[PDB]
Amino acid sequence: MDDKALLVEVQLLESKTYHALSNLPKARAALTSARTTANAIYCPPKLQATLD
Amino acid sequence: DEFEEFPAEEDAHVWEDNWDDDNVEDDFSNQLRAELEKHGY
Amino acid sequence: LRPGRIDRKIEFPPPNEEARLDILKIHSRKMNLTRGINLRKIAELMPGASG
Amino acid sequence: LPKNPDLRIAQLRFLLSLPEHRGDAAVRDELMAAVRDNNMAPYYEALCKSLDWQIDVDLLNKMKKANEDELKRLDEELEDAEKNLGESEIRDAMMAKAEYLCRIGDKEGALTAFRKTYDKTVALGHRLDIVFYLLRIGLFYMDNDLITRNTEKAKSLIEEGGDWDRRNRLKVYQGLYCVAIRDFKQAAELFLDTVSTFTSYELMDYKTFVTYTVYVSMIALERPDLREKVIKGAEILEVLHSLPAVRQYLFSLYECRYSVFFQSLAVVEQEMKKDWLFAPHYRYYVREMRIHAYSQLLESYRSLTLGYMAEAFGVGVEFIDQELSRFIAAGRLHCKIDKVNEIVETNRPDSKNWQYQETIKKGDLLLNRVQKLSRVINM
């Protein structure tokens, strides 16, 4: 589906949950995917702050 | 040079076993439990 | 480029779909591919690859 | 891969075969449900004869008739494929027949059917699948020769040509067999290699695989490799976050919390006693883990009083004295006990001294070899 804002939010949530479980490589990969999808849509200040 | 002068006269384990394995004693859990109980008082 | 100094001029067109799949197999032989790595889909995603 | 044969069935059978759990009820219900759903008539009869249970006449006859009519249908399909369909159809029909033969528990018939299918199968992938099926059968029954020969065959097939997924699955299978043979070093190596991409869910779920990997790695890997490959491993840590007991056990050794380590080691010994694969080696695993913990503690000390180490291990002075004496007698720990003063002194050889001992031993071996060669050749 084309709703990329919720996709970015969900990828960030997955990255955070991965980090909480000590799976740093997968968490970083998920965060990189989230950043890639974020630099393709309008990242509001709140979403940008969460990603950063 | 077969030494015929000396006559030439289950446990199909492929793993090498040292002597300590044969020793019979209570499982480690029982030993630790008993020791903790005896040192708890 | 006279037909006495150069007799055969073989053209090298960019590989077609089957050619791209063959090249992918050639260069992916030593790679550790994973089940579900269908190369026909990847080749279809390269319409005019230089080779 | 297919779940058949189901290794959970073999584990339940072994658990019932254990003295304490022979009378267990829940395992009884689970095994009976599995047999009824899968309709293992030969397996049911073998289990009843081995465990001296009461054979259910109605259930046994129903299962036998179901197996008979299913086998008749499979044979009819095989004949139809032979008469009408091509070689691929006949190969698949025989594969299905062998799969159902394994379904019911007929070891000999299933093995012969799979051998025939392999003989009539040309595709390399299908041959690898047949080898995997036979390996799973061997693990279910614990046939050492079958597993060894089939592992060699699978290795040869992969060497000729093989995808990465099959190599990973065969790595996991070799690790399981090595754990079952007590070659824990190879088990740790293979499991640490495959933990990243565990795709063999038929043998065991991921949690069990991570637990086995932690156990074998700690029994095999040394402290640096243990920290680099298990402690900091993302996959193992993520899985252990759902297994508090295993995480505590693994971290007790690395963090130097020896009392919790011994609690977890007792728990692990109890768990392995019931396990169908670590059962033959559970005593050895516990003994070696205790030896490793003792050596790890002694590495940083030269003379530690028996009282301090007894307090650290949460055990009495007498028990630690007896265990240390037993382990020293076997030449595993490098220490000598001093009972009168209650002080344990480490006698770790100096690098020069250990090197001299190693050179003496290796040179003696080489000199014996050279003497034998000279005697053989000089005539």
UniProtKB/Swiss-Prot annotation, chain A:
Induction: By FOXO4; expression in embryonic stem cells (ESCs) is mediated by FOXO4. Component of the 26S proteasome, a multiprotein complex involved in the ATP-dependent degradation of ubiquitinated proteins. This complex plays a key role in the maintenance of protein homeostasis by removing misfolded or damaged proteins, which could impair cellular functions, and by removing proteins whose functions are no longer required. Therefore, the proteasome participates in numerous cellular processes, including cell cycle progression, apoptosis, or DNA damage repair. In the complex, PSMD11 is required for proteasome assembly. It comes from Homo sapiens (Human). Belongs to the proteasome subunit S9 family. Highly expressed in embryonic stem cells (ESCs). Expression decreases as ESCs differentiate. This is 26S proteasome non-ATPase regulatory subunit 11. It is found in: Nucleus; Cytoplasm, Cytosol. It comes from the Eukaryota. The gene is PSMD11. The chain holds residues 160 to 211 of 422 of the full protein. Component of the 19S proteasome regulatory particle complex. The 26S proteasome consists of a 20S core particle (CP) and two 19S regulatory subunits (RP). The regulatory particle is made of a lid composed of 9 subunits including PSMD11, a base containing 6 ATPases and few additional components. Phosphorylated by AMPK. The lineage of its organism: Eukaryota, Metazoa, Chordata, Craniata, Vertebrata.
Swiss-Prot record, chain B:
Keywords: Nucleus, Proteasome. GO terms for cellular component: cytosol; integrator complex; nucleoplasm; proteasome complex; proteasome regulatory particle, lid subcomplex; protein-containing complex. Coiled coil: none annotated. Expressed in limb bud, craniofacial primordia and skin. One of its GO terms (biological process) is proteasome assembly. It comes from the Eukaryota. It is found in: Nucleus. Component of the 26S proteasome, a multiprotein complex involved in the ATP-dependent degradation of ubiquitinated proteins. This complex plays a key role in the maintenance of protein homeostasis by removing misfolded or damaged proteins, which could impair cellular functions, and by removing proteins whose functions are no longer required. Therefore, the proteasome participates in numerous cellular processes, including cell cycle progression, apoptosis, or DNA damage repair. Belongs to the DSS1/SEM1 family. This is 26S proteasome complex subunit SEM1. It comes from Homo sapiens. The chain holds residues 17 to 65 of 70 of the full protein.
Swiss-Prot record, chain C:
It is found in: Cytoplasm; Nucleus. Belongs to the AAA ATPase family. Component of the 26S proteasome, a multiprotein complex involved in the ATP-dependent degradation of ubiquitinated proteins. This complex plays a key role in the maintenance of protein homeostasis by removing misfolded or damaged proteins, which could impair cellular functions, and by removing proteins whose functions are no longer required. Therefore, the proteasome participates in numerous cellular processes, including cell cycle progression, apoptosis, or DNA damage repair. Component of the 19S proteasome regulatory particle complex. The 26S proteasome consists of a 20S core particle (CP) and two 19S regulatory subunits (RP). The regulatory particle is made of a lid composed of 9 subunits, a base containing 6 ATPases including PSMC5 and few additional components. Component of a complex with USP49 and RUVBL1. Interacts with PRPF19. Interacts with TRIM5. Interacts with NDC80. Interacts with PAAF1. Interacts, in vitro, with the thyroid hormone receptor (in a thyroid hormone T3-dependent manner) and with retinoid X receptor (RXR). Interacts with ERCC6. This is 26S proteasome regulatory subunit 8. It comes from Homo sapiens (Human). The gene is PSMC5. The chain holds residues 306 to 356 of 406 of the full protein.
UniProtKB/Swiss-Prot annotation, chain D:
One of its GO terms (cellular component) is cytosol. It comes from the Eukaryota. InterPro entries: PCI_dom, Rpn7/CSN1, Rpn7_N, RPN7_PSMD6_C, TPR-like_helical_dom_sf, WH_DNA-bd_sf. One of its GO terms (biological process) is proteasome-mediated ubiquitin-dependent protein catabolic process. Pfam families: PCI, RPN7, RPN7_PSMD6_C. Residues 183-351 form the PCI domain. Keywords: Proteasome. SUPFAM superfamilies: TPR-like, Winged helix' DNA-binding domain. Component of the 26S proteasome, a multiprotein complex involved in the ATP-dependent degradation of ubiquitinated proteins. This complex plays a key role in the maintenance of protein homeostasis by removing misfolded or damaged proteins, which could impair cellular functions, and by removing proteins whose functions are no longer required. Therefore, the proteasome participates in numerous cellular processes, including cell cycle progression, apoptosis, or DNA damage repair. Belongs to the proteasome subunit S10 family. Component of the 19S proteasome regulatory particle complex. The 26S proteasome consists of a 20S core particle (CP) and two 19S regulatory subunits (RP). The regulatory particle is made of a lid composed of 9 subunits including PSMD6, a base containing 6 ATPases and few additional components. This is 26S proteasome non-ATPase regulatory subunit 6. It comes from Homo sapiens.
